[PDB]
Amino acid sequence: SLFNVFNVTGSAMSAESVRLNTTSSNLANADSVSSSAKDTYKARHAVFGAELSDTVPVKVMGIVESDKPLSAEYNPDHPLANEEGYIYKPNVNVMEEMANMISASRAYQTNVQVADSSKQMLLRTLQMGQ
Amino acid sequence: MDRALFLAMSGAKQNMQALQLRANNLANVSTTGFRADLAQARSMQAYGEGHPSRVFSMTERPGHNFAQGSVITTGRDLDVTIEGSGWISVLDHTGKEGLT
């Protein structure tokens, strides 16, 4: 049943889209010392999962911030400076976010190829015998 | 289409705004009694249903650099500079008191 392939590729494409949006936010918030409520932005990362026990769909199970320390900068005249004159900025690393942009896009496009190829195989089964 | 186009567009638009804010400071290097404007970015998450993956960044002016400026000695009686921290009370053309 190739219709299962559609579920798996669709779940993979959804997972890559979540990863791409996470990368988009990290690049946009790699220079933000402030935040909406009260907590400095930390590089977010989606968590993929495989519930192996046919096909095993890939599901995103939540967003987890990176555990790297916040990059402290000496801005003593800044309003938000601490007692030592340090301000903290998000731990977003440019090199790894660019790799995620490349990896997520190439992984997204190859799952479309599988679904398109799997779509053809179902059609040829319909034409079998006639 | 993916909403990441607008998530990145909204960041690129704000980076231009911060660039213009820094441009005004460089255009006002020689201005008398000019306090440079500070620029930063704020992260505002898009709260709602779904995975928390979309956060916007918008620029703001948290404050100004209130440090003492570069004092120019002119030898003129009607030229004064504030020592340390302070302000001079003036009213503009609207008769509204403001510090200068």
Partner: peptide
């Protein structure tokens, strides 16, 4: 569930007793 996962709801905080108290 995954530990340390972020939530998609405003982060209950301090000022405005309303959040500090209601679970």
């Amino acid at each position: 569930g995954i530990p340390g996962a972020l939530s998609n709801q405003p982060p209950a905080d301090a000022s405005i007793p309303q959040d500090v108290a209601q679970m």
